[PDB]
C-alpha cells in the first residue's frame, strides 16, 4: 500500500531505462528467493512428493502471496504514476519477472526432479506469464498502448524537437502544402544556418532513435514472436516521426528553409537555406537512410512483408523523400535559378539592353548582381553545403548557373561594345559565377565568355571573333547578329553571313 | 474463393516468372532489396543506435541530390 | 438529424463526460473539469 | 538436449533434442512433445549439413 513517493518521474529523458524507483519487490523477489530456498530444502525434507505441493501449491502460494498482491500493487503504483513510465518500467518489472524467474530456472536446478523440470517449471514461468497476461499481450494494452504511450513520448520528446523549427519557421504550407499539392499533383526566417532542425543536429535523429529505437528494443525483445507485425506498427511510427515527422515537418522545418523558394531577387533567405535543406540531405537522408538501412537489417526477422517495410516503408521513402527534396530541389533549383536569371539579368537599359556599340566596356549589374545574387545565394552556404549532393549541387546548380548562363551572360542583350562589358562583366561573372558557390560555370558560362567576346560584333571585330571555338554560343546565323539579343542588332547589316 | 482466387494466385505466379525469363537464363534466386543507401546485449541495441552515430560521420554521408 | 450522433448524443450523454472521463480514475482531486469543464 | 538460441537476438529460443543420425540430422524442439514420435524436425540431411 505504497503511496507513490517522488521521484516519480526524472525517467522521461531521450535515453533508457533510469531514475527512481526500485523495486523494493525485488527486495520482496530476493526474499522470496531464499524463502523459496529455504522452504525448498523444507519441504524437500519434509514431504513425499516434490513439486506438490512446493512446485504445485507453494509456488501457487509465492505468485498468490507476492504477485497478486505487491505485483499488481506495483501495477497500481507504476501505472498510477504515468504509462510510459510503467510502460518502460513494464519492461523492467517484467524484465526483472524474467530475472527471477531465470533466478527460479537456476534455483530450479537446485531441485533435481525431472517432472519439476518439466513444465512445473514452466507451470512457475506459466505464473510468470499470468502476471504478465494481467496486463497481456493479446490485448492492445500491453503493446498498443505502449505504442500510444510510445505516441506520446514519440510526438513529445521528437515532435517538439526541433521545437522553433517544427513549431514554427512558417504558417506552416512552407510548399508542402503549396508545391507538393500542386507540382506532384519568400522570407519566412533569417538568417544562419541549419539551427536545430536538420536533424537535429542528427542528435534529433539520435533523441528519437535513442528513445524510439529504445523502447523499440523494449517492446522488441520484451514481447513474444508476435513481433515483426508491431515492428512495423511503430517501424512505421517512426514512418511518421521521421519520414512524415521529419521529412514533412522537421523537413518542413527545412521547407520552411524551402518557403524561400521561388527566390528571383531573393537569395538572403536562401542563403541561410542552403545548408538548411542541405543538412536535411546530409544528416536526415545519410543518418536516416544507413540508420535506418542497417538498423532495419536487424529488425527484419525473416518475413517476406519485412521486404514490404523495405520497398514501400524505407525504400519508398527515398524515392517518396526523394520526391520530396529533389523536387524542392527542383522549385529551389527555381529558386536559384530564377535568383541568378531574374535577378542577375535585371540590369537597367544603360547594361542589359545597352546600346553602347563603341563604348561601355566594364563592369555593371551583370557583375553587381550575379556575384551579388549567385555569390551570395551559393557562395554563402552551398559553397560549403551540400557535399552530401557535392556534384548535384556544386555541378547540378552550378549546371543551372550555367543555365542562368544561358539567363544571364549569355542572355546579356547589350551592344557592339557593350558586348564586351559582358566580357568583362558576364565573363567577369564566368569565373565569378565558378566561385559562387553554385560553380559549375567554368565551361559553359566560359561559353558565354567567349560569346561574350561575339556579342561585341562592332564594324571592325563582326566576322571571326564571333567565329571563335565557343563563339557559337552566339547563334549559326545569329554570329556576326550575336547582339540581334540588344537593342541595336549589328549596326548595318547584321544578316549577311547565312547567305 | 481458393479457385476465384486460388487461379488469381497462379496466373499471378507465373505472369511474373513470364517477366523473369529475362535473357540470360536469369536464375532469379536472390532477394536482396535495396534502398537509395547502400547483438546478443540489452545495450547492444543502444550500441547499434551509437553504431548509427558512428555511421553519422561516415562516409561524409555523400550522395547525389537533383533534379 | 446529425446531433445524435454528435450533440443530441451529448445532449443524452452529458454527465457521461464527466462520468466517461472518471474511467481512468481507477484504473492506472476532480475539481477543474467536474465544476468548470469549458 | 540443446535449449536453443533465438541467432539474431540472442535470446533463447526454445528447447531442442538434438538427433544426430548415421546421415541425416533431427534438430526437433520436443516441447510440448514429450514423444519423439513426430516432434518438430528441424531436419536435413548429413551430407550438406554445415
Keep these: 500500500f505504497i503511496k507513490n513517493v517522488k521521484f516519480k518521474e526524472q525517467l522521461i529523458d531521450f535515453e533508457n531505462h533510469s531514475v527512481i524507483i526500485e523495486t523494493s519487490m525485488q527486495n520482496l523477489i530476493n526474499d522470496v528467493e531464499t524463502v523459496i530456498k529455504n522452504e525448498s530444502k523444507i519441504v524437500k525434507r519434509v514431504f513425499e512428493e516434490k513439486a506438490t505441493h512446493v512446485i504445485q501449491l507453494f509456488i501457487q502460494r509465492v505468485f498468490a502471496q507476492k504477485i497478486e498482491p505487491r505485483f499488481e500493487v506495483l501495477l497500481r503504483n507504476s501505472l498510477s504514476i504515468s504509462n510510459l513510465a510503467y510502460v518502460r518500467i513494464l519492461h523492467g518489472l517484467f524484465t526483472l519477472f524474467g530475472k527471477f524467474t531465470k533466478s527460479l530456472i537456476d534455483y530450479f536446478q537446485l531441485l533435481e526432479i525431472d517432472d519439476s523440470n518439466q513444465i512445473l517449471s514452466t507451470t512457475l514461468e506459466q505464473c510468470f506469464a499470468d502476471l504478465f497476461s494481467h496486463y497481456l499481450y493479446d490485448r492492445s494494452k500491453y503493446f498498443g498502448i505502449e505504442k500510444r504511450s510510445l505516441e506520446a513520448i514519440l510526438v513529445d520528446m521528437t515532435s517538439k524537437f526541433t521545437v522553433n523549427y517544427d513549431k514554427e519557421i512558417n504558417k506552416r504550407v512552407l510548399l508542402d502544402k503549396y ?103 546530409t544528416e536526415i537522408l545519410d543518418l536516416l537512410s544507413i540508420s535506418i538501412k542497417s538498423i532495419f537489417l536487424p529488425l527484419l526477422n525473416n518475413s517476406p512483408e519485412i521486404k514490404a517495410q523495405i520497398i514501400e516503408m524505407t525504400n519508398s521513402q527515398i524515392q517518396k523523400m526523394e520526391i520530396l527534396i529533389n523536387i524542392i530541389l527542383q522549385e529551389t533549383i527555381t529558386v536559384i535559378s530564377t535568383k541568378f536569371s531574374a535577378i542577375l539579368c535585371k540590369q537597367k537599359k544603360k547594361d542589359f539592353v545597352p546600346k553602347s556599340q563603341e563604348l561601355l566596356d566594364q563592369d555593371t549589374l551583370p557583375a553587381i548582381e550575379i556575384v551579388n545574387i549567385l555569390n551570395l545565394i ?39 561594345i557593350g558586348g564586351v562589358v559582358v566580357t568583362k562583366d558576364i565573363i567577369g561573372y564566368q569565373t565569378a559565377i565558378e566561385d559562387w558557390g553554385v560553380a559549375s560555370l567554368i565551361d559553359k558560362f566560359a561559353t558565354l565568355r567567349e560569346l561574350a567576346n561575339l556579342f561585341t560584333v562592332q564594324p571592325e571585330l563582326l566576322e571571326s571573333l564571333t567565329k571563335e571555338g565557343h563563339l557559337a554560343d552566339i547563334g549559326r546565323d545569329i554570329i556576326q547578329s550575336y547582339i540581334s539579343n540588344r537593342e541595336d542588332f549589328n549596326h548595318d547589316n547584321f544578316i549577311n553571313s547565312v547567305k | 474463393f481458393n479457385k476465384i482466387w486460388g ?32 547483438e546478443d546485449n540489452s545495450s547492444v541495441k543502444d550500441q547499434a543506435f551509437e553504431l548509427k552515430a558512428l555511421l553519422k560521420d561516415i562516409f561524409p554521408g555523400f550522395s547525389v541530390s537533383s533534379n | 438529424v446529425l446531433c445524435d450522433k454528435l450533440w443530441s448524443c451529448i445532449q443524452g450523454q452529458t454527465v457521461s463526460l464527466y462520468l466517461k472521463l472518471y474511467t481512468v480514475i481507477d484504473k492506472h482531486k476532480n475539481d477543474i473539469i467536474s465544476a468548470f469543464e469549458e | 538436449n540443446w535449449m536453443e538460441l533465438n541467432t539474431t537476438t540472442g535470446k533463447p529460443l526454445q528447447m531442442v533434442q538434438i538427433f544426430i543420425l548415421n546421415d541425416l540430422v533431427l534438430i526437433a524442439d520436443k516441447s510440448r512433445d514429450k514423444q519423439n514420435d513426430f516432434i518438430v524436425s528441424q531436419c536435413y540431411p548429413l551430407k550438406d549439413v554445415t
Design chain 1, 179 to 281: 508545391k507538393e499539392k500542386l507540382s506532384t499533383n519568400t522570407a519566412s526566417d533569417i538568417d544562419n544556418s541549419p539551427n536545430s532542425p536538420a536533424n537535429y543536429s542528427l542528435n534529433d535523429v539520435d533523441s528519437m532513435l535513442k528513445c524510439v529505437v529504445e523502447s523499440t528494443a523494449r517492446v522488441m525483445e520484451l514481447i513474444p514472436n508476435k513481433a515483426h507485425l508491431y515492428i512495423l506498427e511503430i517501424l512505421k511510427i517512426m514512418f511518421l516521426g521521421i519520414v512524415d515527422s521529419y521529412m514533412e515537418i522537421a523537413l518542413e522545418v527545412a521547407y520552411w528553409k524551402i518557403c524561400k523558394v521561388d527566390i528571383n531577387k531573393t537569395a538572403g533567405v536562401v542563403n541561410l537555406n542552403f545548408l538548411k535543406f542541405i543538412s536535411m540531405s
Design chain 1, 378 to 416: 551559393f557562395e554563402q552556404s552551398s559553397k560549403f553545403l551540400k557535399g552530401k549532393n557535392l556534384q548535384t549541387f556544386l555541378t547540378l546548380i552550378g549546371e543551372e548557373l550555367y543555365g542562368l548562363l544561358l539567363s544571364h551572360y549569355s542572355h546579356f542583350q547589350v551592344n557592339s
Design chain 2, 7 to 38: 487461379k488469381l494466385l497462379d496466373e499471378i505466379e507465373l505472369l511474373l516468372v513470364r517477366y523473369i525469363n529475362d535473357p540470360e537464363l536469369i536464375s532469379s534466386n536472390n532477394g536482396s532489396i535495396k534502398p537509395i543507401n547502400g
